[PDB]
Structures are given as structure tokens and as C-alpha cells.
């Protein structure tokens, strides 16, 4: 039994690099359980693990589908240590395009995986972290949870929710000695954006010409803004570590300092109209 | 034909008061379409209608439950005027209790009804609104959407979600000529909130003695604040009018100023920890 860490969505991006960063730590103090929605996807994980010579006994891959309470509790009973000190809610789905262009199923999944799942992860672990009176939880934050971005309604929705689920919980947990931290990310080189963008071409068939133009117009800005500050998933894991070490973690950590002006100004405007203006005359 | 309004969840409270205040308006300008999850409950709606002397034809009820796109779809094809100049997304439910004490069917229902349902509506009316190049969208806000409240994890989760859903939409919507704005309200004279009396063993047989205690103490504080801050839908509906009247309404209307200093605090702290301290000290 050492610092037992249970992380979700370890198949790629931040969930992978993190699992291996923690597991391969030179102070061999982290015993990580990298969970995966689907195990068949644990190749690149193991490959990296080997690439770092991440010592025997530290990383045990486990399967965990966030949109399944059955799948979650079982992956919990499989924690031989019988305790989790750090839980990391990381799984998540993206969604882009004209709101009217998405579908009900699509929308449900995003909120299903990104929010409810975070609830299942919490519901199953927090109890035990509470009677114990010690524990740490980390949730992969996002800009879209602190501000609104065009054609990112449902994702910014799923991420704004997490701000809610966490902050309210953070309150009650104060005397409980359990710790909640939202790692607020920005763009980052992960499997996340490399496919979710789908195919911008089909959109025109479920929207008006004026939005479609604006959808590509956003895409073009997106792609430029990404290849300007998309941080390395390793750089991002670094923040997860600094929170972990903090004796008294804060409600949130920020991986990039670029979105902090938009936020600052945004908070100086309660009606939210100065923000909407800026953000708009920024994307387009 | 005149200002057509389609209000969702008018069965009671805010939804019923705005419906009738509009229909029975002096200028007899608004043609209200009060929508209900289940038509039976329109009894109390009509009572207020009658009471308010809403002329014949300025208010016709339709049935539609935002958790069934087939329903929503129908409700729009029932708006004989061919247009909806004012769309109001107001239905939705609350949820209180220790996160672990809640059920999945429950945590789901709230998310599926407060966000998805709001999305379904938008996906239905927003288009024609855009092609018209004229529109008005009112969504019932909340303080839980602006800040986290203990034992209100899932609800504030669903509420914060509307902040992003709408805020992001708003940004795209800027040039289109349609307007989206939330009505950030606080505790009002509504059954649910003032009728939170019970705390069954169901809660007890599903949380730890430490949380159990912080649960009731919450309710006690919550009953007090309500007894001293609860706003009756009456004023709240008055706010909705204030909004739709302004040539260019802002992204956020506040029915009460009682919480502005609390969120004011929120502003000056990126770590979100000053608040978690404050709002805990203030709840417990
Ligand atoms: N970096 C980003 O742009 C970014 C921004 C803000 C926050 N974070 C967060 O961390 C996540 C991953 O982002 P990333 O950028 O690291 O890219 P990513 O490529 O999506 O990496 C994580 C993904 O989460 C998984 N996942 C998806 N659905 C799941 C389900 N039902 N159950 C369990 N796991 C599931 C993984 O497996 P599968 O491929 O098998 O689905 C996976 O690739 C979140 O979705 C979230 O947005 C990332
Ligand atoms: N006022 C509050 O404390 C408050 C605070 C912030 C924001 N708002 C927002 O607007 C709502 C209502 O608050 P209120 O204070 O007016 O009282 P309320 O009693 O909840 O009024 C609106 C209600 O939503 C309905 N609804 C429920 N499930 C539905 C479904 N599945 N499909 C369609 N409609 C459904 C109504 O019909 P049925 O009874 O037949 O279900 C109804 O009375 C939201 O839930 C939300 O919190 C209210
Ligand atoms: C929200 C986000 C960070 C911010 C980024 C994103 C989308 C659009 C966008 C637009 C901006 O003007 C500045 C930054 C970003 C990312 C999508 C995934 C993510 O975490």
C-alpha cells in the first residue's frame, strides 16, 4: 500500500501520460490503476509504460466505462490495496458544430460521460474517502467550463456542470479532510481533438448558410489558436502532480495562463454582455 | 397575429405566473402558449387565468415534456401563427441530498430534463428564429448556476450547465438578431423549496453519520434563508417582462441582488477557495 491512484480515461491524452508519469515516478511512491473504457485500447498505454521502464507493480490497467454503474463499482472492488488516496476523474467527450446540427443521442452521451460519470466516480469513492477523512480527487478542468465558446454549447455545458458538481461538493467536504481540485486545462495535444472535429462538411445540411460559414470561420480560428498554445499532455500532467503535493489544494489549478484575461474581464461584467462581445469579436 | 410566446412547464410557479401575466396583459399583445408535461395539471393554471381575466384566445395550453423530442416537435407544429417570437425554457426539477444518497435514475432525470430538454427546445425553435433574423429566448436562471450550494451538487450541476449552454449560443447568435438571456433567480415563493420537510431514513441508510448531520443542519439554514429571501413568482415573472422589453437585452438578468456580493467575492479568486471557505462558513 502506497499512494494509490485511480485514474479514468487512461487510454490516451492526459489520462495516459498521467498514468505513466505517476507510475514511473522516480520515488516509486505511486501505485496507479489506469482504467480504460475499453481494455482493447491499452496498447499505446503499455507501450509508453515500457518506454519509460515504469517499474513492475506500479501500473495495473483496469477497464472502467464511466457510463455504467456496474462497470464502475467492479473496478472499485478490484483495488487490492482496499483504498484510493487520489482519484482522477478524466474521461470526457467533445462535441462541435451548430447546436441544431447535433443529435439527441450525441448530446446525451457527452453529458452522460462527462457529468453523470463524474457522479458515478464520486458516488463510489467519496464515501470511503469520507469515513477515512483523508483523500484527494482531481477533475480534468477546461476553459469551456469557465467561459463560453461558439459551437461548443453541449461540451461547454458538460464542463460548466463539472464546475458545479465540484464546487458544491468542495463546500461540504471542508471539515471532511477530503480534497477537490479542478485542473483547468486549455488546448492540448490529445486524442480529444484529433477526431471529434468529425467532418465540417455535413453541417450545411442541418443549418442555414450563415451559421455554416461561421462554423468554418470558427474552425479556422480554432485550428490557428490550437497550433499556438496546445500544450503537451506531459506539461499538463505536471499540474496534476503539483496539486497532488499541495498540502491544502485549492478548488482549481490552471495549466495555461492565456485564458486568464478573458476570464478576469468576464468576471467584471455580471450581465455577461461585454464578454459575449469580446469572445465573438475574437473567434470571428 | 402578434407577440407569440411559448412558455414551457407553466403547470406552476414561475411558469404559470409569467404565462398568465402575459396573456392577461393590458396591451392584450401577447398570445401565450402555456405548455405542460401532463395536461391534467392545467387546473390551477386556468384558475389563475380566469382570475386574471385573460381574454379568450390569448392563451392556449399545449402539452410537451422536454424529455421527449417527439413531444417538443408536436408542440411547435401546434403554434398556428407559424412563429414563436418569444421562447421561454422554464421547466426543470431540483435535487437535494448527499451526492451518494441520490439515485442514478434521479441524477439522470435532472440532467436530461434541465439541459437536454433545453437543448431540444432550442434545436426546434432557434432555427426559424434565426432565418427570421428576429427572436427572443428566456431561460430561467439560478444562483446555483452562478455558485455551488452544499447538498445541491447535481442541481447546481444542471444549472451551471445552462450558463454555458446559453452563454456559448449567445456568442454565435450575436449577428443573427435573436436574443438569449437567463433570468438568474433566487429563492421564490414556490412549494418545493418551502416544503422541504422530511429527511427520511432513506437518506440515513445511504450516507455516513458525519454527512447525515451536515445534511439536516443544511436544511435548517436553507429553511431560514428561504423564510427571509424567498421571492414569490409574481416578482420573478415581472423580471422576464423587463428583459423582453429591452431593445437589446443582456445575457443575464438578476431577479434579486442578495447574492451579488457573494459572487462578487467569487470574482476576485481564481482558486475558488476563498468562496468554498466563505459559503461553507455561511451554510454551516
Ligand atoms: N485536452 C483537451 O482538449 C481537454 C480539454 C479540457 C479537459 N480535458 C479532459 O480530459 C479528457 C480527455 O481529453 P484529452 O485532450 O486528454 O483527449 P482524449 O483523447 O479524449 O483522451 C481521453 C479520453 O477519455 C476516454 N473516454 C472516452 N469516453 C469514455 C467512456 N465512456 N468511459 C471511459 N473513458 C472514456 C478515453 O478513451 P476512448 O478513446 O476509448 O473513448 C480517451 O481517449 C476529457 O474529455 C476532457 O475534455 C481535455
Ligand atoms: N424558482 C426556483 O427556486 C428556481 C430557481 C432558479 C431557476 N428556476 C428554473 O425554472 C424551473 C422551475 O421553477 P419555479 O420556481 O417556476 O417552479 P416549478 O414548480 O418547477 O415551475 C416549472 C415546472 O417545470 C415543469 N416540468 C417538470 N418536468 C417537466 C418535463 N419532464 N417536461 C416539461 N416540463 C416539466 C412543470 O410541470 P409539472 O409540474 O407538470 O412537472 C413545472 O411546474 C427550473 O427547474 C429552474 O430551477 C427556478
Ligand atoms: C475549451 C478548450 C480550451 C479552449 C479552446 C477550445 C476551443 C475553442 C477556443 C477558442 C478560443 O478563443 C480560445 C481557446 C479555445 C478547447 C476545446 C477543448 C478545451 O479544453
> Mutation test of ligand 1: which of A8, A40, A91, A113 has the most ligand atoms closer than 8 Å to its C-beta?
A91
Given a contact cutoff of 8 angstroms between Cβ atoms, the answer to whether B39 and B74 are in contact is no
Grid coordinates given for A275: 464578454
Q: Which ligand is nearest to the CA of A75?
A: 1
The C-alpha of B109 sits at a distance from chain A's nearest C-alpha, in angstroms, of: 11
Run of H or E residues at A168:
helix A153-172
Name the residue facing B271 among A127, A147, A250 (closest C-beta): A250
Structure determined via: X-ray
Name the residue facing B153 among A169, A263, A271 (closest C-beta): A169
The C-alpha of A52 sits at a distance from chain B's nearest C-alpha, in angstroms, of: 33
Distance (Å, whole) CA A100 – CA A170: 35
Residues of each annotated binding site of A: 9-37, 65, 142, 159
> How many CA within 13 A on the CB side of residue B184?
23
Distance (Å, whole) CA B61 – CA B168: 31
Nearest CA to ligand 2 atom 42: B9
The C-alpha of B62 sits at a distance from chain A's nearest C-alpha, in angstroms, of: 22
Burial of A261 (0-12, 13-18, 19+ CB in 10 A): exposed
Nearest alpha-carbon partner for B49 in B10, B85, B92, B93: B10
Resolution of the structure in the document, Å: 3.0
How many structural domains does chain A have?
1
Question: In this complex, do B119 and A130 lie within 8 Å of one another by their Cβ atoms?
Answer: no
Nearest alpha-carbon partner for A206 in A283, A104, A133, A97: A97
Distance (Å, whole) CA B118 – CA B162: 8
Given a contact cutoff of 8 angstroms between Cβ atoms, the answer to whether A62 and A36 are in contact is yes
Given a contact cutoff of 8 angstroms between Cβ atoms, the answer to whether A251 and A183 are in contact is no
Nearest alpha-carbon partner for B272 in A243, A55, A271: A243
**203-242 of B, contacting A, C-beta below 8 A:** 207-208, 210-211, 214
Provide the residue range defining the domain that includes B52: 1-284
Question: In this complex, do B147 and A167 lie within 8 Å of one another by their Cβ atoms?
Answer: yes
> Mutation test of ligand 3: which of A96, A191, A225 has the most ligand atoms closer than 8 Å to its C-beta?
A225
Grid coordinates given for A274: 461585454
Grid coordinates given for A241: 502532480
Question: In this complex, do A273 and B251 lie within 8 Å of one another by their Cβ atoms?
Answer: yes
- Tally Cβ neighbours within 10 Å of residue B242: 12
A263 Cβ closer than 6 Å to some ligand 3 atom: no
Instruction: Measure the N-to-C terminal CA separation of chain B; round to a whole number of Å.
Output: 53
Distances (CA, A) of A250 to A31, A70, B156: 24, 32, 20
Question: In this complex, do A170 and B148 lie within 8 Å of one another by their Cβ atoms?
Answer: yes
Given a contact cutoff of 8 angstroms between Cβ atoms, the answer to whether B9 and B79 are in contact is no
What residue of B is the nearest CA neighbor of A261? B270
Nearest alpha-carbon partner for B84 in B208, B244, B218: B244
CATH assignment of the domain containing B138: 3.40.50.720
Question: In this complex, do A208 and B251 lie within 8 Å of one another by their Cβ atoms?
Answer: no
Active site residue B155: yes
Given a contact cutoff of 8 angstroms between Cβ atoms, the answer to whether A92 and A114 are in contact is yes
Nearest alpha-carbon partner for A261 in A121, A143, A166: A143
Distance (Å, whole) CA B34 – CA B25: 15
Distances (CA, A) of A48 to A17, A26, A51, A276, B227: 8, 16, 5, 42, 58
Burial of B278 (0-12, 13-18, 19+ CB in 10 A): middle
Beta strands A3-7 and A86-89 are parallel
Burial of B41 (0-12, 13-18, 19+ CB in 10 A): middle
Sign of dihedral through CA atoms A145, A213, B171, B176? negative
Interface test with A, best of B105, B163, B171 (most A CBs within 10 A): B171
Q: What angle do CA A240, A183, A273 make, to 5 degrees?
A: 160
With cell 448527499, the residue in question is B98
**144-163 of B, contacting A, C-beta below 8 A:** 144-145, 147-154, 156-163
Run of H or E residues at B137:
strand B137-140
3-state secondary structure of A199: coil
**Does the CB of A89 have a partner CB in chain B at under 8 Å?**
no
The C-alpha of A56 sits at a distance from chain B's nearest C-alpha, in angstroms, of: 35
Distance (angstroms) between ligand 2 centre and the Cα of A95 equals 27
Given a contact cutoff of 8 angstroms between Cβ atoms, the answer to whether B14 and B237 are in contact is yes
Q: How far is CA B177 from the centre of its chain?
A: 23
3-state secondary structure of B26: coil
Q: Which residues contact B209 (CB under 8 A, 6 or more apart)?
A: none
* DSSP structure class, residue A184: E
* Dihedral pair phi/psi, residue B8, rounded to 5°: -100, 145
Nearest alpha-carbon partner for B86 in B133, B134, B136: B136
Distances (CA, A) of B231 to A31, B23, B138, B185, B225: 52, 22, 19, 9, 11
Given a contact cutoff of 8 angstroms between Cβ atoms, the answer to whether A14 and A236 are in contact is yes
3-state secondary structure of B195: coil
Sign of dihedral through CA atoms B12, B13, B14, B17? positive
Given a contact cutoff of 8 angstroms between Cβ atoms, the answer to whether B24 and B49 are in contact is yes
Interface test with B, best of A131, A172, A214 (most B CBs within 10 A): A172
Grid coordinates given for B178: 435573436
Burial of B126 (0-12, 13-18, 19+ CB in 10 A): buried
Atom of ligand 3 nearest to the CA of A156: 1
Amino acid at each position: 500500500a502506497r499512494t494509490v491512484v485511480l485514474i479514468t480515461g487512461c487510454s490516451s491524452g492526459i489520462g495516459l501520460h498521467l498514468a505513466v508519469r505517476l507510475a514511473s515516478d522516480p520515488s516509486q511512491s505511486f501505485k496507479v490503476y489506469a482504467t480504460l473504457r475499453d481494455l482493447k485500447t491499452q496498447g499505446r498505454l503499455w507501450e509508453a509504460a515500457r518506454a519509460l521502464a515504469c517499474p513492475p507493480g506500479s501500473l495495473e490497467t483496469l477497464q472502467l466505462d464511466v457510463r455504467d454503474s456496474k462497470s464502475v463499482a467492479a473496478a472499485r472492488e478490484r483495488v487490492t490495496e482496499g483504498r484510493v488516496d487520489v482519484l482522477v476523474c478524466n474521461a470526457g467527450l467533445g462535441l462541435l458544430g451548430p447546436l441544431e446540427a447535433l443529435g439527441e443521442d450525441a448530446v446525451a452521451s457527452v453529458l452522460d460521460v462527462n457529468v453523470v460519470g463524474t457522479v458515478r466516480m464520486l458516488q463510489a469513492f467519496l464515501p470511503d474517502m469520507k469515513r477515512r477523512g483523508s483523500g484527494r480527487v482531481l477533475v480534468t478542468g477546461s476553459v469551456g467550463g469557465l467561459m463560453g465558446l461558439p459551437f461548443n454549447d453541449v461540451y461547454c455545458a458538460s464542463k460548466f456542470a463539472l464546475e458545479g458538481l465540484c464546487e458544491s461538493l468542495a463546500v461540504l467536504l471542508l471539515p471532511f479532510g477530503v480534497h477537490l481540485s479542478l485542473i483547468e486545462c486549455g488546448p492540448v495535444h490529445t486524442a480529444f481533438m484529433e477526431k471529434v472535429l468529425g467532418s465540417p462538411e455535413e453541417v450545411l445540411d442541418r443549418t442555414d448558410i450563415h451559421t455554416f460559414h461561421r462554423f468554418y470561420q470558427y474552425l479556422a480560428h480554432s485550428k490557428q489558436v490550437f497550433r499556438e498554445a496546445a500544450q503537451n499532455p506531459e506539461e499538463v500532467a505536471e499540474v496534476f502532480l503539483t496539486a497532488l503535493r499541495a498540502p491544502k489544494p485549492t478548488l482549481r489549478y490552471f495549466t495555461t495562463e492565456r485564458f486568464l484575461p478573458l476570464l478576469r474581464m468576464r468576471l467584471d461584467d455580471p450581465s455577461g454582455s461585454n464578454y459575449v462581445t469580446a469572445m465573438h469579436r475574437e473567434v470571428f
